[PDB]
Structure formats: C-alpha cells, structure tokens
Amino acid sequence: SGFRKMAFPSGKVEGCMVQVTCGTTTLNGLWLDDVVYCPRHVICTSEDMLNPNYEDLLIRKSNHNFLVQAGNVQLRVIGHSMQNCVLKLKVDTANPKTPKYKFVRIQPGQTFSVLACYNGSPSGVYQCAMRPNFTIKGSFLNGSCGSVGFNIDYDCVSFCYMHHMELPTGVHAGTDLEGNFYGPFVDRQTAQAAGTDTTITVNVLAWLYAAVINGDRWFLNRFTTTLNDFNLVAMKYNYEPLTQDHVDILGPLSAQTGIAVLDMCASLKELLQNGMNGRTILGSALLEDEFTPFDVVRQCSG
Amino acid sequence: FRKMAFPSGKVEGCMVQVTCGTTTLNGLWLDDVVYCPRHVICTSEDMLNPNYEDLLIRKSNHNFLVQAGNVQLRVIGHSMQNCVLKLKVDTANPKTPKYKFVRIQPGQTFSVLACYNGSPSGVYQCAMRPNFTIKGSFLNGSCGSVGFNIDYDCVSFCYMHHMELPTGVHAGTDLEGNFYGPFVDRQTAQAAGTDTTITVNVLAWLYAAVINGDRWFLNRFTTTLNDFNLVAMKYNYEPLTQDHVDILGPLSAQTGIAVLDMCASLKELLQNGMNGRTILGSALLEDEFTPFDVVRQCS
C-alpha cells in the first residue's frame, strides 16, 4: 500500500502512432523519422495466418499496396522491407513529432508502459511487467497489434515492445522494435504454450527494500547467503534465480538502506522457508513482484 | 483486466511551472490563462492561517514566474477563484485541447497526470473516494497536477492537487477551486471522514473477473436489494441504488449473471473472506473500476 502501477506519460508516443492497412487487415504502426514500423502479419489474410509464408507474401507486395494513415491523412510509402517479424515502411514524410528515442530489448522482470491503440488511435496507457516466461499480462483486443511498450528516460523514449498475439492462457506475446520475439513464440495463428511462469525475485527484493524505506522491517534477519545458495533454494519455491545484473540493479536501494543485497536475499529465503506467519509487509501477506528497483525509487524518492 | 489511464498527451501540452518566492508547483495553461493552487503565494510563516485575499492583493504580476519548458510566460493579470489562482498570460497555448471543467461524484474515476516542476512524470487511475480523498501517488512539488477524463477529443478536467493527509491519502479541488471534502488549504494535519468501499465498483470488477473466465466466487443464491444493503452497510460498503443496478445491466446481460446474484456473491465474500484465493490477481476487493471502465476495456 502506498504503491501503485504508474505509467509514463504517453504523449511522446501518441505523436508516433499511425495505422497500417493491407486489404481489410488494419493494425497500428510506429512512425519515427521517415519509417513506420509494424507487425509483418499485416500482410496476411486470415487464411494466411495459419502457416504464413511471409517471404512469399512479401514479394507479391508493392509499396502501393500499403495504406499508412495518421488519422485520416495518408502517408505515401516509398519503400518496404522485413526485419525479423516487423515490417519497415519507408514513407515520404519525416514525423515532426519524432522524440529522441532508442530501441532497447528488455530483460524479464523489467516493466514498461503500454499505449494500447486501435486504428491508430490511443485508448489507454498502463504498466506491464515482462514475465520470466516472456509473456506480458496486457489488455489487448482485436486490432491492438502494433501497440508499443516503452520507458522514458529524461527526454528519450526507449521502445521495447510491439504487440503481436495472444496465447491460450490469455497472456500476450510480442517482439522488440527489431522484430525479435521475446520468448520462443512465432507469429502464426497456431496454439502455443508459454513456459511455466515463475516469481520475479529481483522485484520481490525491490519490494522488501521499499518496505524497509517506509519503516516496515520486521523481516530483516541477522544472516546472509551466497548467491548460488539463494538461487538453489529460490528455484524450489518457483522463484527466478538472480543474475549478476539483478544484483547490480538492486545496488541503489541497497545503498539507500544500507542492507547488502545478499543479506536481503537471506531475509527473503527465511520468508520462503518459514512463511509469513499471518504478518504483513506494506499491508499485505502477498509479496509483490511487478515493481522494479527503478519503480520503487520513483515512488519513494521521486 | 488492467487499471488503465487515459492517454495523457493532450494534458501534457498544458503543464507549466509556476514559482512565487521559494514556492514552486505546477500550473495548467489553457488558452491564455494558467490555473494553479493559490497556496503558491504562501511563505512558511503564512501557511498556518493564510488570509489569501489579503496575501494576494499584495502581489504583483511580476512576482509570478511561469515557465513553459525553456520559455518564460509574462503574467499580465491575476485573479483568485476559491482555492485556484488564475494567471492571465500574454501568450495563448496552441496546444490547448477541447476541454471542460467538471466536478466529479464520489465513486467516479479519473486519470492523474503527476507532474513536478511543470514536467509530467507519471499517469495513473484514481477514484474519488466516498470520503472525498483520493489514494494518489503525490510527492513534494506535485501540487497543480490535474485529474481528468477524455470523451472523444474533449478533456474533462475534474481535479487539481493541493495536499496530503497524515494517513497518506490526498486532497484537492475541482478546477473552480472548490475542495472535494472537508479540507482546507492551510498547513495543518487533517483527517478525513470514515471511508467506505464503492460497492457498485466492486460489483463491476467481479463481473470483469467473470468476463476473464474467473468465477470461483459465484454461488447458487440470491438476495434482495435491501438485505444486501443491510449487510453492505455493516461492512462499511456504500449502499447500492437502483440506478447502480441499472448501470450494471450491460455487464449482467453479457455474463448472464443477475445483478442481485452477483450481490449474493459479494455478500458471501464479505462474510467468508477470500481465504487465500485471489480475484484478477488481487487478494483484496478492488473498488476503483466503474462499470463504464470495465466496459470500455472489454470493447
């Protein structure tokens, strides 16, 4: 309590959303400088989506087959190519609202804001976490493909996700802005299973640090652990093992509280092995795993 | 089913920084007027009992520094409306959206664009609590951040931020400067009335969970409206009105679950708890989705 999922302001990304139509298939695209990025399955008929031959489908296409619109204003396409599972449509106008940006590929556990779009028009913005099985729990309906996920650092938009599909379990899958899927998924209208999901350990630790920052520290014990010993125990409770990068991104919170990362790991290990015992942390018996160390600092320190 | 804020770009283009003395907060720049909390004019030794009319008449236009990014805006006049200051500037904001000022009802939801030094930092969904607080995320310098809804291309501004309470919740005004609730823009520790849970919103969220294939909490029973309300009031839930039942019609139809049947489900949850189980990931009954919110996100 005192914490909520907070998205980044969406305006810089709103200014880049367009619609891309092939035939009657419409989805969203991202217009940066003179290129529009979108999922390559825009070129598919519904009957092609079963087992599309994207390469053969693309050679039958010409620039004049792609309808790109910002609102009702057509953007003329002057070139096209495919990079992994994304289509890059060169257009004759550089987007005057292009922010400073980069394309980043995120790691599981990292959070990002999603600007859910339909027909090139934004509907809503919300925060998502990349699960360890490389799915996200989005709120995506038909026509949402091409909606993007992003973080904003200073003036710079880091695009990290483009939406492509839904799985039998109702979670969602997609690519980075270079078209490489997160996880083992493919853009075919076939049934695909996500791996068993696990709890995001690094984010649980961030949450415990947040509890400590707010004076809730009953769970701190007098012991420590090695990273390997912690990782082996953690996996028995369906928690992700920590990476070295996880240890490093906890550094600022460790410094803020003076609690070594591996000491917090020992406290978490005791919570896993011994349970909560009816106690709460930040007002809950459940450990939250969708706040990153960066999210915690934003809401504790501003 | 996620807590979804409105896209914030139309509001971002209106946020500016307002400084007076050593106080800095945010303003909302629409056409040639900047709206901001009037306590920007207060010093430390003013905040305990500020006679705002007396403090404001002693101010000159040049005492207000307004910055939109790298550009200073020249203040050419000012007036006060309740707890909001209106600074006339010599430049019109070309990014002014179509907009209106509305006062929202308790139980209604809105998006908050949290800003610091006139720079937008985050966006999230809040409800106006029955006790007229909001459970926000606001730090030092967030005052003048606004709350809003969007209908078509029209931004309806309903909230401007002024203060935090010792319990950690928040209070503020509409854009006419009238507080929601019994709060006052003086530097005192203020308590709210007893909060209650927004029952119509809990019911909407239970329907949402069903829509998403989750129905462990349903049961074979029903209840009358009044018997439900007796139990609701016992657990500090708001009463359900017939208008609320009507409003839930579309969700009832979509799911084939009569409103009063869902009320009997909620009654069971209030009396039996959730006993470890969770709904839509939550171990608590969520009451900051309205029926409209649930529908807008299943469409």
Ligand SMILES: *[C@H](O)[C@H](C[C@@H]1CCNC1=O)NC(=O)[C@H](CC(C)C)NC(=O)OC1CCC(C)(C)CC1
């Ligand atoms: C693109 O807008 C769309 C969004 C999907 C559709 C509904 N919810 C979403 O997130 N993506 C697709 O239609 C996608 C196209 C293929 C070629 C990648 N296919 C898809 O997501 O099919 C899913 C298969 C499993 C079930 C039937 C459970 C849901 C649809």
Ligand SMILES: *[C@H](O)[C@H](C[C@@H]1CCNC1=O)NC(=O)[C@H](CC(C)C)NC(=O)OC1CCC(C)(C)CC1
């Ligand atoms: C304006 O930016 C600021 C925002 C507050 C500060 C901390 N979190 C917020 O939301 N509002 C004020 O400083 C406000 C000014 C008066 C004149 C209305 N005062 C205020 O909020 O005081 C609170 C009293 C209780 C405690 C100390 C718990 C928090 C500050």
